[PDB]
Structures are given as structure tokens and as C-alpha cells.
Amino acid sequence: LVPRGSHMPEETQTQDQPMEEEEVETFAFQAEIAQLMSLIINTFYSNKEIFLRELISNSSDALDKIRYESLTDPSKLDSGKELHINLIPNKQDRTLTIVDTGIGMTKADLINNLGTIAASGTKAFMEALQAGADISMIGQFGVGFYSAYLVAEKVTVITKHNDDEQYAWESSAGGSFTVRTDTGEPMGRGTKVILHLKEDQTEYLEERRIKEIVKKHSQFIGYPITLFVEKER
Ligand SMILES: Nc1ncnc2c1ncn2[C@@H]1O[C@@H]2COP(=O)(O)O[C@H]2[C@H]1O
Ligand SMILES: [Mg+2]
Numbered sequence: 001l002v003p004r005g006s007h008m009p010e011e012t013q014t015q016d017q018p019m020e021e022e023e024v025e026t027f028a029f030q031a032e033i034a035q036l037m038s039l040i041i042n043t044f045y046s047n048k049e050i051f052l053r054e055l056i057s058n059s060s061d062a063l064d065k066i067r068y069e070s071l072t073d074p075s076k077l078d079s080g081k082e083l084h085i086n087l088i089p090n091k092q093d094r095t096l097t098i099v100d101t102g103i104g105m106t107k108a109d110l111i112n113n114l115g116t117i118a119a120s121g122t123k124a125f126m127e128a129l130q131a132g133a134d135i136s137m138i139g140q141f142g143v144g145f146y147s148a149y150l151v152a153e154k155v156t157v158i159t160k161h162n163d164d165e166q167y168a169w170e171s172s173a174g175g176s177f178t179v180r181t182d183t184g185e186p187m188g189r190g191t192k193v194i195l196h197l198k199e200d201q202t203e204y205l206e207e208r209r210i211k212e213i214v215k216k217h218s219q220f221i222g223y224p225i226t227l228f229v230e231k232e233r
């Protein structure tokens with residue numbers, strides 16, 4: 001009744017998909033973890049570059065788990081995903097992302113493994129730091145992940161395990177973290193740790209620096225690692 005030969009883009013713009021709800025929960029760090037994070041963030045250390053070794057070690061442990069889980073669950077052999085790590089600096093956003101195709105984490109794994117449960121070595125490690133230990137000793141005390149706060153003001157962890165949905169963990173320290181369901185970009189099995197770098201820590205976006213610290217500290221990953229470099233415009 002109202003003939004048309006051509007429409008403007010706004011006229012044929014599709015209706016939005018239904019808005020999704022994401023459930024968010026907020027948790028306090030275990031008291032000694034909170035102490036540790038306050039000590040890490042607010043103290044000068046000479047050797048901050050070991051954060052990357054700690055996050056790559058976590059990824060390598062998650063990748064090893066794939067191989068062994070196949071002994072009680074052979075279907076993982078059928079995945080076509082390569083077992084690998086990618087490092088992804090974004091100079092536009094000032095973030096460094098460590099991506100793996102390991103086993104991932106469930107929601108309860110994020111809550112229990114990344115903040116609420118005591119690590120037995122945490123008090124000993126804070127005393128070793130007081131007595132002048134090098135921050136590099138952190139992984140030997142079972143709290144390596146929190147080294148990310150040597151260089152990052154905020155950390156976001158996106159993760160997907162076969163036995164659960166995709167979740168995001170996030171914390172800017174200050175004593176709390178959040179876990180929420182993540183209905184955004186499905187990432188497939190594995191974990192992405194997104195470091196929001198502090199203003200004076202932007203050297204960890206540079207490709208030569210990243211290659212230097214991988215070669216110095218992470219030579220026995222056991223899986224291919226790949227550094228994605230944004231082409232300079
Ligand atoms: N990349 C990752 N993939 C899977 N789990 C992780 C990752 N990073 C940290 N974690 C979990 O966080 C925990 C930190 O302490 P652990 O190294 O004992 O065990 C670690 C894993 O359970
Ligand atoms: Mg370990």
C-alpha cells in the first residue's frame with residue numbers, strides 16, 4: 001500500500017536481541033591474601049617482570065591437565081583446539097592478555113582458587129618479603145597469581161571449563177573481587193587473564209620486552225607460545 005524501492009539503514013536495522021541478565025557476586029579476599037595484595041601493590045620491587053612467568057606457569061599447569069584428564073575422560077582427545085598460549089598486548093587499551101586453551105575454571109573454582117581460600121605459605125611469604133626476599137620467590141609459596149598486581153591496577157579473568165558456563169572474575173584489589181556470568185564473546189575452553197597495566201608499567205606492551213622476559217624466565221612451557229603484535233599504523 002506504501003511502495004518503497006530503497007530503505008535507509010536505520011529503517012531496516014534489526015531489533016536488538018533480548019537483553020541478557022548476568023548474575024554478579026562479590027567476595028572478600030581471605031585476610032592474608034588481602035594483606036599480601038596490599039603489600040605487593042604498594043611496595044617497590046626491582047624484578048617485577050616475573051609476573052609473566054607466574055601466569056604462564058599457571059597456563060602450562062592447566063594445559064598439562066588436558067593430557068591427564070584424557071585418561072579418565074577420552075573425549076577431550078576429540079577436541080580440535082591446539083594446546084597453546086597466546087600473549088596479546090593492546091597498546092590502545094594498555095592491556096596485556098595471557099590466553100590459554102587449558103582446562104579452564106568453573107564458577108566455584110574462581111571463588112575458591114582466586115581469593116577465598118587460604119594458601120598455607122602466605123604468612124611465611126610475607127615474612128620472607130619483610131626480611132628482604134626477592135619477589136621472584138612468590139611462586140614457591142603458592143600465591144604466584146597475585147604477582148599480576150606488580151604491574152596491573154586491575155585484573156579480569158575470563159574462563160570456560162567443560163563442566164560449567166563462561167565466567168568473569170575481576171578485582172582492583174582493595175579487599176574484594178567479583179565473579180559474574182559472562183554472556184559476551186564465547187571464548188571456548190580455557191582462560192584469558194587480562195592485565196590492566198599501571199601507567200608506569202607500559203613496557204610490558206612492547207614486543208622486544210615481552211620476548212626478553214619469556215626467554216629469560218619461561219623456556220620450559222612445554223606448549224607453543226605465540227606473541228600477537230598489532231601492526232603499527
Ligand atoms: N590459566 C589458568 N587456568 C586454570 N586455572 C588457573 C589459571 N590461573 C590460575 N588458575 C587457578 O588458580 C590457582 C592458583 O593457585 P594454584 O597454582 O595452586 O592453582 C591455580 C589454578 O587452580
Ligand atoms: Mg605450582
Ligand SMILES: [Mg+2]
Pocket residue numbers: 060220221222
Ligand atoms: Mg611443565
